[PDB]
Structure formats: structure tokens, C-alpha cells
Amino acid sequence: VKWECPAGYEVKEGLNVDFPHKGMKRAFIVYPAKNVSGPAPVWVPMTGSVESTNDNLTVARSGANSILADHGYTVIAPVRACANQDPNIRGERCNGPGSNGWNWNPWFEGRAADPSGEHWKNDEGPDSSFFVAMVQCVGTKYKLDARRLFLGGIASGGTMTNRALLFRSNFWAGGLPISGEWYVTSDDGTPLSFDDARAAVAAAPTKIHQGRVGPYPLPAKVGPLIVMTVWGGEKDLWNCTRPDGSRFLCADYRPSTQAGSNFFSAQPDVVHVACSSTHGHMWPQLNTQEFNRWALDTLASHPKGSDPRSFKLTQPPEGYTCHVGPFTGLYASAWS
Numbered sequence: 001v002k003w004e005c006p007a008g009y010e011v012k013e014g015l016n017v018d019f020p021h022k023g024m025k026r027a028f029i030v031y032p033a034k035n036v037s038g039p040a041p042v043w044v045p046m047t048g049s050v051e052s053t054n055d056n057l058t059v060a061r062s063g064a065n066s067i068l069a070d071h072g073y074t075v076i077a078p079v080r081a082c083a084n085q086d087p088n089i090r091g092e093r094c095n096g097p098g099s100n101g102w103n104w105n106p107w108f109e110g111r112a113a114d115p116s117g118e119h120w121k122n123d124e125g126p127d128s129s130f131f132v133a134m135v136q137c138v139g140t141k142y143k144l145d146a147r148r149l150f151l152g153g154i155a156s157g158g159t160m161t162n163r164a165l166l167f168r169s170n171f172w173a174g175g176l177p178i179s180g181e182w183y184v185t186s187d188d189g190t191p192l193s194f195d196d197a198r199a200a201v202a203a204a205p206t207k208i209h210q211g212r213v214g215p216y217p218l219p220a221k222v223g224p225l226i227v228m229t230v231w232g233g234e235k236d237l238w239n240c241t242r243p244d245g246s247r248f249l250c251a252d253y254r255p256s257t258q259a260g261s262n263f264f265s266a267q268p269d270v271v272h273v274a275c276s277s278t279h280g281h282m283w284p285q286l287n288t289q290e291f292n293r294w295a296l297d298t299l300a301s302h303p304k305g306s307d308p309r310s311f312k313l314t315q316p317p318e319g320y321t322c323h324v325g326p327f328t329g330l331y332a333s334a335w336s
């Protein structure tokens with residue numbers, strides 16, 4: 001990991017704007033760690049389709065992620081490109097289908113189902129590379145622990161976490177994809193509709209499924225990571241909105257959290273922790289701050305390059321059930 005900023009960029013506490021990356025001007029917010037001497041572990045939280053970055057950082061029901069700074073983490077939170085650097089934008093011009101080959105507009109988190117997405121089969125995209133540049137620049141002003149760089153988020157932010165872990169597994173130490181998509185495809189890369197993708201995992205729940213969220217094909221081996229995937233239970237679903245305002249089911253996070261857990265659990269240098277709750281599709285609601293503290297400290301207990309055999313899971317807060325490995329309570333087992 002190298003600490004460097006675009007020439008002349010002056011990083012500051014709080015809001016940073018006009019950060020140049022791949023022809024775009026990006027923004028992000030920095031909360032330096034509290035009560036920490038020396039390099040601090042890093043948390044890069046990402047909002048979803050409708051909550052603003054400020055909501056994700058400061059509103060309790062959205063996770064109040066900036067509070068992890070009070071927990072000893074330097075929080076570096078990116079603003080979505082679609083928000084045009086405004087951390088208060090919610091769903092305006094963000095909550096909807098993507099353009100330029102991207103599937104969904106909040107983040108560059110998955111290739112679209114039509115051929116315009118072809119190019120993103122093996123190019124991480126501008127958000128994944130921006131986040132690396134962002135953290136590398138902040139690290140010139142604040143002492144960051146290069147073995148404890150973690151990112152994570154909810155919904156589309158969870159999808160982005162999955163993408164970033166798959167394309168930058170030699171940078172991040174791990175992540176927290178909460179109710180993110182995998183955009184399951186056939187083994188040959190063919191995009192599947194929501195319904196067909198949902199059925200593909202139900203038909204082979206323990207297999208590693210390809211997906212538009214990542215490289216095609218997915219990498220045979222990723223760098224060392226700890227990944228904690230969170231499913232919100234039976235109601236962890238998303239209904240999209242048509243131009244006329246009507247709603248329709250367009251995502252089910254049971255197959256996508258399962259698929260992500262299957263891929264990461266099979267990786268030899270990855271510790272995968274599968275967590276289930278019952279709060280639905282939104283930031284964890286039960287004992288929210290206890291969960292954020294437990295989850296980030298669990299990730300930090302496995303610094304990059306740590307032996308997976310040395311990992312020891314501790315009990316999560318009331319309202320969560322977690323274990324190392326793939327999800328097991330989402331689909332009936334083979335042996336049953």
C-alpha cells in the first residue's frame with residue numbers, strides 16, 4: 001500500500017470535494033479515529049439506493065456509521081457519483097437503473113444485463129478504483145493501518161462491497177457486504193433475469209455461482225480477506241419503482257448473500273462469516289451500534305495476511321446469528 005494524493009490535493013477532516021479520478025470529480029467525508037495512537041484501522045461505509053451518505057453516516061436508523069470513529073476507526077465515506085458530490089442527495093438521480101453498461105446507478109457495482117455491460121466483465125470500474133485512490137490519499141494525512149482497510153455497505157452499497165472485494169482483494173483487508181446483490185448468471189456468463197437468477201441458486205444452493213457483480217469468470221484465487229456477509233431474513237427483498245410509480249419485486253437477497261458466502265467460503269485465504277438477522281432490507285436495526293462495533297472489531301481481529309486458522313469468532317449482539325462458512329439456514333440441505 002502506498003500513500004499518495006493527486007498532486008496538490010489537500011485532504012481534510014470532514015467533507016472533501018473535487019477529488020480527481022478517471023475524469024470524474026468525487027467527494028468523500030473523513031472522520032479520524034478517536035482514542036487511537038499510531039495507525040488506525042479504516043472503515044469505508046457506503047450507503048444504498050435511497051439513503052444519503054449523510055444518512056448512512058449520522059442517522060441511527062441508517063447505521064450512523066460516523067460513530068465508528070468514536071470506536072477507534074478512521075471512517076472514510078465516499079459520496080455516490082450520481083449524487084454530484086452532494087452527501088445529502090437521497091434517491092434523486094441515483095435510485096434507478098445504471099447507464100454506460102452499469103446495472104444500477106448508485107454505484108458502479110455490476111455490469112448491465114445487455115451487451116453494453118460486456119466491458120465491465122474484467123474492468124473494476126470507477127468506483128472500485130476511486131476508493132483505493134481515496135484511502136491512499138487520506139493515508140498521507142492520517143495514520144492508517146494498511147493491514148486493516150475495510151469497506152462495506154447496505155444494499156447497492158453491499159453490492160459495491162462485493163465488487164470491490166473481488167477486484168481489489170490485494171488492497172482491502174476485508175469487508176461487510178450487507179444485503180448486497182451478486183447478480184447471478186449462468187456459468188458461461190449469460191445474464192439471467194431476476195426470476196431465473198433466483199431459481200438458479202435455489203436449484204444449486206451450495207455451488208459457486210458466477211455473477212455480474214464481479215469479474216467474469218470470478219477469480220480462481222483472491223488475496224487474503226475476512227468477509228462478513230449479512231442477510232436480513234425473509235423480508236430482505238427490494239421492490240423497484242417504475243417511471244409511473246408502481247412497484248415490483250426486483251431483488252431477493254437470500255440467493256445473493258448465499259452465493260457470495262459460497263464463493264468467499266471456498267477461498268483458502270478468506271475467512272467468511274455468514275450472519276443472519278430479521279430486520280429486512282435496511283441497515284441492521286436490532287442493537288445497531290452494538291452490531292457495527294462487533295462487526296468492525298471482528299473484521300479487525302483478522303488483519304490482512306492473518307492465518308484463517310487463527311480466527312476466533314465471538315458472539316454477536318442479540319438479534320444476529322453468525323458462523324464461519326457459507327450460509328446454511330437459507331436453503332434446505334442436500335442430505336435432507
Ligand SMILES: CCCCCCCC(=O)O
Pocket residue numbers: 048049050103104154155156181238240250251
Ligand atoms: C435491476 C434491479 C437491481 C436491484 C438493485 C437493488 C438495490 C437496492 O437493494 O438498494
